[PDB]
Amino acid sequence: MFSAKKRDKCIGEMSEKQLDLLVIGGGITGAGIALDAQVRGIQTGLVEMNDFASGTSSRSTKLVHGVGKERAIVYENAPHVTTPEWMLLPIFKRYMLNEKQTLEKEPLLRKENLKGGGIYVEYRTDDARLTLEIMKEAVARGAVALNYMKVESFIYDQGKVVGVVAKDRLTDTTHTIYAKKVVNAAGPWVDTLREKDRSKHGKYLKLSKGVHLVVDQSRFPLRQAVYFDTESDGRMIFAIPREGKTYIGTTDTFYDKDIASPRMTVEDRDYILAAANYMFPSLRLTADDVESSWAGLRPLIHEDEIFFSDSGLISIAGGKLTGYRKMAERTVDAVAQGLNVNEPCTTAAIRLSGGLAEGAQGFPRFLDEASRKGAKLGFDADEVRRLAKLYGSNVDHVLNYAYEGKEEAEHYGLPALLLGQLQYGVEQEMVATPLDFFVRRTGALFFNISLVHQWKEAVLRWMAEEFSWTEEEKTRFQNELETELKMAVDPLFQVE
């Protein structure tokens, strides 16, 4: 089905049945359109150049901003992806807090001039898993999707776009896909597809880079997330606690290089650590405290719109995380308009992949339950609990593979529970790369980079076997992962 071992059966599956809609982009937006369109009867296909969420949808600060109602919808439909937590906004010269109280919330805050603060609740999500769960739900309802399929050229007929040309980045082959409507939800790449349609006119895009560093909690012991100012600068910064770590706020610099390879520079790092130390003088945050980091590209219109060409291509310059749903409904409104569909948007009711029927409230009982069910399979109750939180109701699936592969796992010298996450990833999360698993299905590259160092050998060895990789594939797929691991910590690591 949605496995990375059936790609050929999935390529010739959408290049056979004529598609009503084909969307370019596996971002939160592409997945968003894919799901909505699919749940209205518009048979949709989706093509993602690299990995689902591999673009900017995996490089945000991961905050679902509150819009208030929309933030709920998201939470209730997938409580394991988003979780509300407290945010602490210090004050210098909802709950209104004075100085002593503020210091009591975060006893690490700068004392000098602290007048107080306000603490409120904010929903923290998993941009990559969110993107994915929308994808999995879309596919589950009839949508066909493929990562590592790159649209390199458009197909026209009587002046109109009727299909794309996609190159399978994993096998290097090319294919043709036809669709009644073609949406371009390519994020910061939108204009490239607009050039391949020769319609990049008027309002074009200008890119802006932002970076996040990640230090270990022991070295930045935040009680709850804090939203603070900067010394000189003029901007604000987000220090967020997660999985025993604290990833610190964002930078803002112009960007016009390669849209697929932005990363942390020495300026970026020295800028985040600087401010962080300004706000928390107790810490002596140096370049050796950062154990990981990431860069992302944010597009801005020059001279949340939607573009229409003379060929009929629909581009989504918007690209919203917090507002992805209405954004999708709006986009599908246009598609449905064109293909003429008398079907209402009811996506705010659709639970996402792994979402509980009971919605948020029902999740505690859910973990207590899944924790006990996993234990009866001879697994650590706390371990499965954490996996339940990760995978949502889909834990059963990972608990099945994990169960079934106790022998395989031993032979491959890796914990059964980890082997379960892999088979699920390959067979039901369309994982075809080690990078897919370590950075997007688990987020380990960012939040537990030592874990990927520990298991990169054993994992590559297994995948090599699971996919019948050649020497070139095994070696390449190993350099790809090794490369990112290097860029994650070292800003001087030179490529090529």
Ligand X SMILES: Cc1cc2nc3c(=O)[nH]c(=O)nc-3n(C[C@H](O)[C@H](O)[C@H](O)COP(=O)(O)OP(=O)(O)OC[C@H]3O[C@@H](n4cnc5c(N)ncnc54)[C@H](O)[C@@H]3O)c2cc1C
Identify which of residues 193 and 431 has a Cβ nearer to ligand X in the complex.
193
- Select 250 or 433, whichever has its Cβ closest to ligand X: 250
Of 104-112, 184-192, 436-444, 478-486, the segment contacting ligand X by CB under 6 A is 184-192
Cβ proximity to ligand X: between 63 and 398 the closer is 63
C-alpha span between 268 and 381 (Å, rounded): 41
Q: Does 65 bind ligand X (CB under 6 A)?
A: yes
Binding of ligand X by 188 (CB under 6 A): yes
264: phi then psi, degrees, rounded to nearest 5: -65, 130
Closest distance to ligand X from the beta carbon of 182 (Å): 11
Of 43, 246, 292, 322, which one interacts with ligand X (CB under 6 A)?
Answer: 322
Q: Which positions from 137 through 166 interact with ligand X, judged by CB under 6 A? A: 150-151
Q: What is the DSSP letter of 352?
A: P
Selected from 26, 392, 425, 434, the binder of ligand X by CB under 6 A is 26
Residues 300-319 close enough to bind ligand X by CB under 6 A: 319
Query: Residues 11, 35, 55, 241: which binds ligand X (CB under 6 A)?
Result: 55
Q: Which two tokens stand for residue 490?
A: 């070292």
Using CB under 6 A as the binding rule, whether residue 126 contacts ligand X is answered as no
Exactly one of 206, 219, 320, 456 binds ligand X (CB under 6 A); that residue is 320
- Contacting ligand X (CB under 6 A), which of 28, 78, 328, 390? 28
- Region of residue 246 (left: phi > 0; alpha: psi -120 to 50; beta: else): beta
Of 20 and 436, nearer to ligand X (C-beta) is: 436
**Taking CB under 6 A as the rule, does residue 81 contact ligand X?**
no
The two structure tokens encoding residue 108: 């690490």
Asked if 63 touches ligand X (CB under 6 A), the answer is: yes
Q: What angle do CA 413, 409, 420 make, to 5 degrees?
A: 130
Question: Residue type for 158, please?
Answer: Q
Q: By CB under 6 A, which span of 60-68, 169-177, 372-380, 429-437 interacts with ligand X?
A: 60-68
Min dist. Cβ of residue 460 to ligand X (A): 23
Contacts of 149 (CB under 8 A, 6+ apart): 11, 47, 48, 49, 166, 167, 168, 169, 175
* Number of residues lying near ligand X (CB under 6 A): 36
Is residue 27 a contact partner of residue 319, using CB atoms and an 8 Å limit?
yes
Which residue lies nearest ligand X, judged by its C-beta? 187
Query: Which stretch, 115-123, 294-302, 389-397, 425-433, contacts ligand X (CB under 6 A)?
Result: 294-302
For the bound state, the minimum distance from the C-beta of residue 164 to ligand X, rounded and expressed in Å, comes to: 8
Q: Which range binds ligand X by CB under 6 A, 52-60, 341-349, 357-365, 474-482?
A: 52-60
Closest CB 341 distance from ligand X, rounded Å: 24
- Which of residues 38, 43, 57, 394 is near ligand X by CB under 6 A? 57
**Contact stretch for ligand X (CB under 6 A) within 61-69, 216-224, 281-289, 380-388:** 61-69
Q: Pick between residue 412 and residue 447 the one whose CB is nearest to ligand X.
A: 447
User: Which residue's CB is nearer to ligand X, number 60 or number 82?
Assistant: 60
Q: Is 27 in the site for ligand X (CB under 6 A)?
A: yes
What's the alpha-carbon Rg for the chain, to the nearest Å?
23
Binding to ligand X in span 231-250, by CB under 6 A = 250
Closest distance between ligand X and the C-beta of residue 368, in Å? Answer: 31
In the set 90, 163, 296, 355, which binds ligand X (CB under 6 A)? 296
Q: Does position 46 bind ligand X by CB under 6 A? A: no
Give rounded-to-5 percent helix, strand, coil for the chain: 40, 25, 35
Return the range that interacts with ligand X (CB under 6 A); candidates 45-53, 69-77, 87-95, 467-475.
Answer: 45-53
Contact positions vs ligand X (CB under 6 A): 24-29, 47-50, 54-57, 59-61, 63, 65, 150-151, 185-189, 193, 210, 250, 296-298, 319-322
